[PDB]
Amino acid sequence: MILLEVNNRIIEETLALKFENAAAGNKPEAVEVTFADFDGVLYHISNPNGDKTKVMVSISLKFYKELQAHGADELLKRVYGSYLVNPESGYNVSLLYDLENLPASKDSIVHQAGMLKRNCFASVFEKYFQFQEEGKEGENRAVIHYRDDETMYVESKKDRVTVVFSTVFKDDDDVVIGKVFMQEFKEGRRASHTAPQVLFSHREPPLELKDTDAAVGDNIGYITFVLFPRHTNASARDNTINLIHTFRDYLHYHIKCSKAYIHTRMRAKTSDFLKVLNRARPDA
Amino acid sequence: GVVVDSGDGVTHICPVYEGFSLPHLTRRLDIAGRDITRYLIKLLLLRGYAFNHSADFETVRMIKEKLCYVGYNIEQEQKLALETTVLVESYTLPDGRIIKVGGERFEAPEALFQPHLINVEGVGVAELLFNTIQAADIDTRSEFYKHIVLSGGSTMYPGLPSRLERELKQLYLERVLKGDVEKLSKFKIR
Amino acid sequence: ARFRKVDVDEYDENKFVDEDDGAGPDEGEVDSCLRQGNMTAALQAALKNPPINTKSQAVKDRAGSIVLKVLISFKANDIEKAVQSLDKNGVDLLMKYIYKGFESPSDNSSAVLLQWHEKALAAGGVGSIVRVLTARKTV
Amino acid sequence: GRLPACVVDCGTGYTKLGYAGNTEPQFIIPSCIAIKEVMKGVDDLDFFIGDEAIEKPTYATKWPIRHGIVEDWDLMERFMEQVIFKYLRAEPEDHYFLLTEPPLNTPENREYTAEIMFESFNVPGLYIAVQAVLALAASWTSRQVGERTLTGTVIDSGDGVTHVIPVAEGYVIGSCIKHIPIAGRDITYFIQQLLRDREVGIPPEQSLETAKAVKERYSYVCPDLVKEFNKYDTDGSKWIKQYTGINAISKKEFSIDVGYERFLGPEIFFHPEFANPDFTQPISEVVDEVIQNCPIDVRRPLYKNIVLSGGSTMFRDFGRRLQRDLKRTVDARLKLSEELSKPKPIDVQVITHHMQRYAVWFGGSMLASTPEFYQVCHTKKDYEEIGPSICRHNPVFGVMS
Amino acid sequence: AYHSFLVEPISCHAWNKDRTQIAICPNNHEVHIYEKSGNKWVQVHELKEHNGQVTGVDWAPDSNRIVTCGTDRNAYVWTLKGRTWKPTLVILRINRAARCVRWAPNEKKFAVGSGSRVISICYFEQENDWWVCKHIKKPIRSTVLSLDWHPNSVLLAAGSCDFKCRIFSAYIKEVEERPAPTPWGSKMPFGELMFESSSSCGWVHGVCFSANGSRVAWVSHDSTVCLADADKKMAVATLASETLPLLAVTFITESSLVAAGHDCFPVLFTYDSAAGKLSFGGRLDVPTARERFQNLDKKAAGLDSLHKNSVSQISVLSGGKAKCSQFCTTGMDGGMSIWDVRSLESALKDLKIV
Amino acid sequence: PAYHSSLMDPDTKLIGNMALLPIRSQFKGPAPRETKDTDIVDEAIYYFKANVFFKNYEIKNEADRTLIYITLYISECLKKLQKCNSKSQGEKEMYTLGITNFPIPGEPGFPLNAIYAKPANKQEDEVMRAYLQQLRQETGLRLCEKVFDPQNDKPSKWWTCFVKRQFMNKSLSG
Amino acid sequence: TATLRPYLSAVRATLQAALCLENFSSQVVERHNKPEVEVRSSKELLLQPVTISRNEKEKVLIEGSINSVRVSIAVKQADEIEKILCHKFMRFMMMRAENFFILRRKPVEGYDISFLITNFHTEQMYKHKLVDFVIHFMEEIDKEISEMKLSVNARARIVAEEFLKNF
């Protein structure tokens, strides 16, 4: 697995199972599941008021207010319609599935439910992609604190939309590894000439953010994606959002997988050294 | 002269003048072999070997007798344990499993000199030995110091005699002198 | 503990004490030879009267400089001949200075010093290195 | 914090994974990994785990854990990659992890595990729990108990071998453990033979299929063989069942009768000689032998708190039969005594409860949901300042306060 | 002629008077005794008393007594009663490991070099029926590694980790009597320092007195061999080697020495009295009809020496130090070699010897 | 574990070290006449389905030796009853089987020669030979009413399934 | 290179000189046996430490004694990624010091990796093969660090390409 998946397997498997038993005519079993996603996301799947014929899926994002300022409530309603209800205390968005009133295609709602986190983030991109398409320049940039100490900046310009990530490498050595990955991204147009352009600044924001309170430090790295109309149009939009919202986690995932691979190299070389060493003995 | 006897149950420092013992000037130490085996169990636990205090007491006792020793300079011993593997010895358990024992070899017996390590009040076999000789008769101090003798199963740890000697030098230098007047500070533990 | 902080061993009468007592080669002489392109001659002069007995590292560090100055000034192909002009004692002393040099690398100084090591080893064998190791009085 | 810890219980046959506080695991997947077989580029990432790994054409299925211990560290590490990033979808730097180990796992293996978790996944905190100890904690859910205790005898029976493990004060008495070569697979095979000799129309290449199903759907433990045989031979209409499966080849239906195998399968725990020529000790005798090998002082508490773990201990009346049979051996022993010479009668209790199948994971989940867990975990800061040696010892907790 | 007794070190050895039995310490707390049966070696005795590694063994020829010393600080004198060797404890009065031991030629005393920076001179008193020892202390400042007795049984050579080879008097009037003067000096009171080498480099691993005692030789860790000539006012000839340190040395004539050590093979050295000079003349380990046949090459570790690890002891087997005909080496490879001086002279036309 | 007989009596007689237990039977032989409603043969037949799986068996009584013989014999009957088509026919094969001379303790071909006492004299021989035959005869006919279902030609699979199993891993045909 | 061979040749000869050890019972502590180069309680038992350097960065420190030799190596580290790769690899080996029994658990200050070789090793292993091993090790850690570097770079290109091509 190179690319990270977008959908949540716990949500889909949980709902699929409830939906198949409901359709089969079985009595419903109680469900109570608390689990996470990347970026400090917390989910809760439960039976509201103990009614086992109702299944609620809730998401909590510390930065939801920020997404709401950029259309989240509207998009979520467009996607989930009547499944969307008043949010459970402790959470920002809640979906309610009535087992006695399921649609003909149960698989399709399982899929959208699995993409709840992605769908929360979608509005901010769609908003700035729209700005670009309409030629509305000068609009204030979106500022999304997706992690306690990380920030995503979205700005629409005449011919492009920029997405800037301010990420933190807690492990000093991960910065060094991360720089190897970022240099390849910087040179990426050498393999896909139409792909977004990527920039990288270590320990300092891009100049446009120098006058704000953007973080500065030895373990901070800034990454800029430059998205063009071919990436931001109505036809490419969904796929583009699916990718860009996973980028930060994609990078950190690959740094960790690289370290694991290097461990395999170390096991092999050390094992070989020990065999040589033992061959220096006359024997037992 | 003074005899240091450490067995499995208790320790005793017994001075003797031209014939017999003198209860006044006789002190007992609240730490002995069993206490060292117990501390070893605790040390091994910290190393990841959870031996049961009852079921495996004899096994850990056997590990102690075979591998334990008394450190001369704990600072140096700790450096050896932390920075090298020269102290690491393999020991085969009765069920065939082989474990690896290192720094715990000198740590366990150190309780004899640092009773607080096992939550016991006191000053340690050596400081104790010193206080017995220092307070006694003035006309036997010299004779006493040069006639200390070890006895018992818990006194056979490699290095024990050398450690005792070193600890008395440090005590005599500090609590009987101040500057360097050692040379003549003669005393042998044979 | 306190009483354990003192290293009583430093006052042990039964320890071991080295036999110590209380200038180097002629700087001007080495310079003369070098200035005249007489390298072998400079080598032999730099190896004279080594401060094997002084306490201060300043005088020792001085002779090592002079000796090192000479080794660096040498042409690669002319090393073997100079080394072969020395007696066994000279070869042993040279090896001591070479190891000395390994501790102050700068530019390609170690690069030529490895050449010297090779030639000196060819002349004095591993025994000359052994004698760097157990010297109590050294450069 | 707002986010629950990750709980992963890696077994020889299956790995149970999820988030602390939950009653059941979010995933139960076979502990296998399918790879392609000088790695270059991203070849190391081309793999699948669990069910997605059992049947993949261009890939070879590997089992990194043999006898509960890791035998391939490269593969165990890769396996963990997907556990975290594909199934849990946890940012590992944001979650403390609870992992498990069999008793007798070495401290070295503990360091290898910590090396992967801290140095590859950058976890903030780690605890390694002993399986049997978690199984004990899991039993605190039982109605039969009133005080929390980590002294007991754990019977762990999954698919491979059955273990009898005495624990005192939260630490397994390693020198007293005994193993039994009877587990789920053995039960299946015996049932297979029984069907082979009696029923017809069973596709050979589907012989196991039927046997396992018969076992999972119709097997149980009976209190007396002859009485049971007599039952079936009299009221057969309400004791004999029928099973019907489909021929993978031809798509037609075969119907078979299910009888004696229902009670004969699980019986081999108590009469191993029925199926195993090399082992004959009944499980009740193994347990007695273990407890009598433990310190006298702890043999009464051990007899009073015998706990079960694993799917093979789930047969109806398994615990009742164990408790009965063990009570008989022990009562019989104390009979001889009196006669020869009034030893207080020994209380034998086999605990069964609802969370047995994944008792280990459940105990893990309950414990990792408490503040105490966070106190006892080893932090990344300590791992860095002190070293992997700190992971050699993982203090027990959950009982006293 | 190599034989492998084991694959770990032989720590020390000694032969009986007739050279029919060899005692060895196989890197152990034990001493094992071997004897030939035809052309095979067979173990005949196991001496087990020490609670530490045995680091020295010597065998008194005529009285047929074995003495052993070990890291347990003890020494034992072993006496053969019937078919079994029985030990008697000898108290050295030391608090560190014993390192080396040698019976004097008169078999009335033995000397043990120790980590107590002292030499224990032991003798039996047929008055109290036990062994006693006197220490030679001043001015030894480090572990004593090697010993060799002068033929007069009084003078004793010692090599130590303080870089010195020394000669002391071990004169014990109660077992021997006023020794005749020697070029080493007229005054030989107990513990008298007769001679002390003048180098402050290299542990002195081995020492040996010539057959007549007027010469003493020693090898040090600084890859030198030295010889002090009492007939030349104790003048010292030195020879610096191009190879690794020697651990063991013995005279084979008044003017010839054989030594071995970390190179793993025996070498020859000669002394020119006139010039007072030591010369290297060696390397004695060079790779009839039976011989011709046996030596013929075949149709086709990685050392070119018989021993495969350092040689730590050499002993003269036949001919004495005056005209040695055969000598023995043991080493850290667990091997034992017997070398024949005449064979060596034959195979090496350029061989000197004197 | 395995089922043992509870029919040994302080006045039970012995033929060798086998228990000369009474049976209810019209067949000739030295078996005492049984008055109770059950006897050793019913017991063996009752315990068979369980006992036959056992590999080890502790001889507690001389009754067990008799119980064991009958258990092994039931196996011999099932071997023959396996291949037959009718309750009537099965009864005939069982008569034949009962009459055939099976080995007795002391002979090679009889398993358990280490646990069964051989006949000491010719009388003892002939009398043990008669008992054994009278046990076989009654066992066999009694087994027929069990093996066949009121549906003729039905050597019940619930009895047939044991044809390959060997009590204690032994055989009378071995 | 051109200074690789000359460097290893000089290191090798020095190791041959230093690896001349014997069993030495402690002179300081009764019934103890300790590596003299580590404890250093008897100055006369210590040899002169010597350094061999290839340049300002790469060098080997060799410290001898009567019963033990300590060997420390400063490894070539051209850039940041080589620095981290080296640090991780040495740490990885050091964690496993019990199995890799001639390795110190921590390096001498100023070096990347250190060996402690005692008379017990030279008794049970051919000393000349121990020498060969150190040289082999110096050569192979360099090659492995280079291969590791190529690996990370190679995987990084595919990772950037896989993400970017999907837009």
mmCIF file of N, CA and C in Angstrom, chain E residues 1-5 10 13 15 22 24 41 258 260 264-266 284-285 305-317 326-340 344:
data_model
loop_
_atom_site.group_PDB
_atom_site.id
_atom_site.type_symbol
_atom_site.label_atom_id
_atom_site.label_comp_id
_atom_site.label_asym_id
_atom_site.label_seq_id
_atom_site.Cartn_x
_atom_site.Cartn_y
_atom_site.Cartn_z
ATOM 1 N N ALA E 1 57.045 -31.868 15.133
ATOM 2 C CA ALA E 1 56.000 -32.850 15.590
ATOM 3 C C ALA E 1 54.949 -32.270 16.563
ATOM 4 N N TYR E 2 53.884 -31.752 15.973
ATOM 5 C CA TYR E 2 52.683 -31.265 16.665
ATOM 6 C C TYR E 2 51.658 -32.297 17.119
ATOM 7 N N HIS E 3 51.100 -32.056 18.295
ATOM 8 C CA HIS E 3 49.973 -32.803 18.784
ATOM 9 C C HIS E 3 48.970 -31.848 19.403
ATOM 10 N N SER E 4 47.690 -31.999 19.077
ATOM 11 C CA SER E 4 46.641 -31.166 19.681
ATOM 12 C C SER E 4 45.999 -31.852 20.865
ATOM 13 N N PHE E 5 46.237 -31.320 22.062
ATOM 14 C CA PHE E 5 45.607 -31.837 23.269
ATOM 15 C C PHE E 5 44.184 -31.329 23.415
ATOM 16 N N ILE E 10 46.620 -24.387 26.302
ATOM 17 C CA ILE E 10 47.384 -25.047 27.330
ATOM 18 C C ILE E 10 48.003 -23.855 28.089
ATOM 19 N N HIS E 13 52.781 -26.032 31.163
ATOM 20 C CA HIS E 13 53.159 -27.435 31.185
ATOM 21 C C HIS E 13 54.441 -27.725 31.976
ATOM 22 N N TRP E 15 57.291 -31.487 32.281
ATOM 23 C CA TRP E 15 57.579 -32.887 31.991
ATOM 24 C C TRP E 15 58.255 -33.583 33.181
ATOM 25 N N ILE E 22 53.743 -35.797 30.450
ATOM 26 C CA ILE E 22 53.607 -34.347 30.420
ATOM 27 C C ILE E 22 52.364 -33.945 31.226
ATOM 28 N N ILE E 24 49.680 -30.951 31.921
ATOM 29 C CA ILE E 24 49.194 -29.738 31.280
ATOM 30 C C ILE E 24 47.954 -29.191 31.999
ATOM 31 N N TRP E 41 48.854 -40.638 22.471
ATOM 32 C CA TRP E 41 48.889 -39.994 23.785
ATOM 33 C C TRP E 41 47.650 -40.460 24.554
ATOM 34 N N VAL E 258 66.560 -20.229 22.184
ATOM 35 C CA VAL E 258 65.364 -20.431 21.390
ATOM 36 C C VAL E 258 64.211 -19.753 22.136
ATOM 37 N N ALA E 260 59.865 -18.133 21.591
ATOM 38 C CA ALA E 260 58.625 -18.129 20.823
ATOM 39 C C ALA E 260 57.615 -17.216 21.527
ATOM 40 N N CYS E 264 53.853 -17.154 16.799
ATOM 41 C CA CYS E 264 53.401 -18.553 16.785
ATOM 42 C C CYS E 264 54.450 -19.600 16.377
ATOM 43 N N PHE E 265 55.711 -19.214 16.261
ATOM 44 C CA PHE E 265 56.774 -20.150 15.879
ATOM 45 C C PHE E 265 58.073 -19.866 16.621
ATOM 46 N N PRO E 266 58.897 -20.893 16.770
ATOM 47 C CA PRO E 266 60.181 -20.738 17.457
ATOM 48 C C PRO E 266 61.227 -20.067 16.603
ATOM 49 N N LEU E 284 62.707 -21.264 13.042
ATOM 50 C CA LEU E 284 62.972 -22.691 13.008
ATOM 51 C C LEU E 284 61.772 -23.517 12.546
ATOM 52 N N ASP E 285 60.647 -22.857 12.295
ATOM 53 C CA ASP E 285 59.437 -23.531 11.841
ATOM 54 C C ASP E 285 59.256 -23.251 10.352
ATOM 55 N N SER E 305 52.591 -21.863 10.230
ATOM 56 C CA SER E 305 53.290 -22.417 11.391
ATOM 57 C C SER E 305 52.558 -23.626 11.985
ATOM 58 N N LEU E 306 53.266 -24.503 12.705
ATOM 59 C CA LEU E 306 52.620 -25.643 13.372
ATOM 60 C C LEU E 306 51.584 -25.178 14.414
ATOM 61 N N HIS E 307 51.982 -24.250 15.283
ATOM 62 C CA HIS E 307 51.048 -23.712 16.269
ATOM 63 C C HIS E 307 50.151 -22.678 15.567
ATOM 64 N N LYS E 308 48.887 -22.647 15.950
ATOM 65 C CA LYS E 308 47.912 -21.766 15.338
ATOM 66 C C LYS E 308 47.490 -20.619 16.260
ATOM 67 N N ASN E 309 48.213 -20.422 17.346
ATOM 68 C CA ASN E 309 47.954 -19.279 18.225
ATOM 69 C C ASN E 309 49.240 -19.125 19.028
ATOM 70 N N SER E 310 49.356 -18.068 19.823
ATOM 71 C CA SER E 310 50.632 -17.731 20.453
ATOM 72 C C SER E 310 51.258 -18.864 21.256
ATOM 73 N N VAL E 311 52.583 -18.974 21.205
ATOM 74 C CA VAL E 311 53.306 -19.954 22.016
ATOM 75 C C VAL E 311 53.675 -19.296 23.363
ATOM 76 N N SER E 312 53.294 -19.909 24.480
ATOM 77 C CA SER E 312 53.495 -19.294 25.781
ATOM 78 C C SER E 312 54.493 -20.003 26.691
ATOM 79 N N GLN E 313 54.988 -21.174 26.290
ATOM 80 C CA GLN E 313 55.987 -21.848 27.096
ATOM 81 C C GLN E 313 56.929 -22.710 26.238
ATOM 82 N N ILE E 314 58.211 -22.655 26.567
ATOM 83 C CA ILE E 314 59.198 -23.519 25.923
ATOM 84 C C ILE E 314 59.928 -24.238 27.046
ATOM 85 N N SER E 315 60.256 -25.519 26.851
ATOM 86 C CA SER E 315 61.048 -26.259 27.824
ATOM 87 C C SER E 315 62.043 -27.157 27.083
ATOM 88 N N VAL E 316 63.193 -27.389 27.705
ATOM 89 C CA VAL E 316 64.211 -28.270 27.141
ATOM 90 C C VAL E 316 63.895 -29.703 27.554
ATOM 91 N N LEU E 317 63.848 -30.602 26.578
ATOM 92 C CA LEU E 317 63.474 -31.989 26.831
ATOM 93 C C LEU E 317 64.666 -32.920 26.993
ATOM 94 N N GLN E 326 66.540 -31.716 22.003
ATOM 95 C CA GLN E 326 65.095 -31.609 21.765
ATOM 96 C C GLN E 326 64.456 -30.597 22.731
ATOM 97 N N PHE E 327 63.503 -29.822 22.231
ATOM 98 C CA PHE E 327 62.774 -28.866 23.069
ATOM 99 C C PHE E 327 61.284 -28.923 22.756
ATOM 100 N N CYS E 328 60.486 -28.410 23.686
ATOM 101 C CA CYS E 328 59.033 -28.507 23.633
ATOM 102 C C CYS E 328 58.384 -27.149 23.681
ATOM 103 N N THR E 329 57.338 -26.958 22.880
ATOM 104 C CA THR E 329 56.529 -25.733 22.969
ATOM 105 C C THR E 329 55.052 -26.062 23.197
ATOM 106 N N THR E 330 54.410 -25.279 24.058
ATOM 107 C CA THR E 330 52.954 -25.324 24.229
ATOM 108 C C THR E 330 52.387 -23.920 24.010
ATOM 109 N N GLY E 331 51.118 -23.866 23.601
ATOM 110 C CA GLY E 331 50.523 -22.613 23.233
ATOM 111 C C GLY E 331 49.047 -22.465 23.482
ATOM 112 N N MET E 332 48.563 -21.283 23.138
ATOM 113 C CA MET E 332 47.181 -20.898 23.355
ATOM 114 C C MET E 332 46.239 -21.623 22.375
ATOM 115 N N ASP E 333 46.812 -22.316 21.386
ATOM 116 C CA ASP E 333 46.035 -23.148 20.459
ATOM 117 C C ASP E 333 45.732 -24.545 21.049
ATOM 118 N N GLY E 334 46.249 -24.827 22.230
ATOM 119 C CA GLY E 334 46.019 -26.121 22.841
ATOM 120 C C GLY E 334 46.926 -27.216 22.293
ATOM 121 N N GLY E 335 47.920 -26.817 21.521
ATOM 122 C CA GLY E 335 48.899 -27.719 20.922
ATOM 123 C C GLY E 335 50.228 -27.807 21.635
ATOM 124 N N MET E 336 50.897 -28.947 21.440
ATOM 125 C CA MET E 336 52.206 -29.229 22.022
ATOM 126 C C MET E 336 53.135 -29.742 20.910
ATOM 127 N N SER E 337 54.292 -29.100 20.751
ATOM 128 C CA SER E 337 55.230 -29.489 19.712
ATOM 129 C C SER E 337 56.551 -29.923 20.312
ATOM 130 N N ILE E 338 57.156 -30.915 19.667
ATOM 131 C CA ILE E 338 58.488 -31.406 20.009
ATOM 132 C C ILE E 338 59.408 -31.117 18.825
ATOM 133 N N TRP E 339 60.482 -30.401 19.094
ATOM 134 C CA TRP E 339 61.399 -29.966 18.068
ATOM 135 C C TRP E 339 62.740 -30.668 18.273
ATOM 136 N N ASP E 340 63.321 -31.116 17.173
ATOM 137 C CA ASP E 340 64.591 -31.836 17.221
ATOM 138 C C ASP E 340 65.685 -30.973 16.605
ATOM 139 N N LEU E 344 66.548 -29.897 12.621
ATOM 140 C CA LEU E 344 66.470 -28.503 12.220
ATOM 141 C C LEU E 344 67.740 -28.092 11.491
#
